[PDB]
Amino acid sequence: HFPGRAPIDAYGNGGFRFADMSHRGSIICIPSGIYGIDMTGPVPTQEDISRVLEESDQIEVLLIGTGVELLRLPEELRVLLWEKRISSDTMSTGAAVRTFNVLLAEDRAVAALLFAVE
Template structure:
């Protein structure tokens, strides 16, 4: 499906998607990718939603573990710190159908003030374009919509 006629060359825009590809700035990718409105399009080393890890989600969200008291974990204080340019929301495109991420993976991002939403890749692509056009700080991690996945 073609999403728009013209892409803003200054911003990464999802321009189309199909049964086995995601098109960003009119370049087709047949593998999972992650990207923000500005910067490079990166290959995402996942094949399925179950491949997402807490560490990968922290990276996508621009979070790092707080460097505080080394004994803080004893009190349950393992807070994450947001980078100044961290996204407000991370969108996960789960392929043809919506599949949710486990709460144990999303809770640390939510606790740090970063929204995270899992939805079909088509919905995530549309949502990303809307948020990006509004000037929001958003990161998308999209899996292709493979019919047999």
């Protein structure tokens, strides 16, 4: 936890490194900060993305890191994200980290939900 977005400096080992900190577990990175989320699995739930929906006025794009393999976004989540005009896409956690960092550096209104991989 950290009160804004920061580049994600590492992934692997069931967590992430950012802002000279280490966090064990999955994370969501939104304009209001980086928060732990208790994902039991790589496919996000409605709860998982609740902070994104709530801050949708400040988010244009959501990257979803679905672990080691790219997984489809469930129908229910596609609808909710669409309703808030957030453009979103899934890719491996590694790919999402790298893409998040790049878009963050470009000052895009980007958010990421990242399932922590080994």
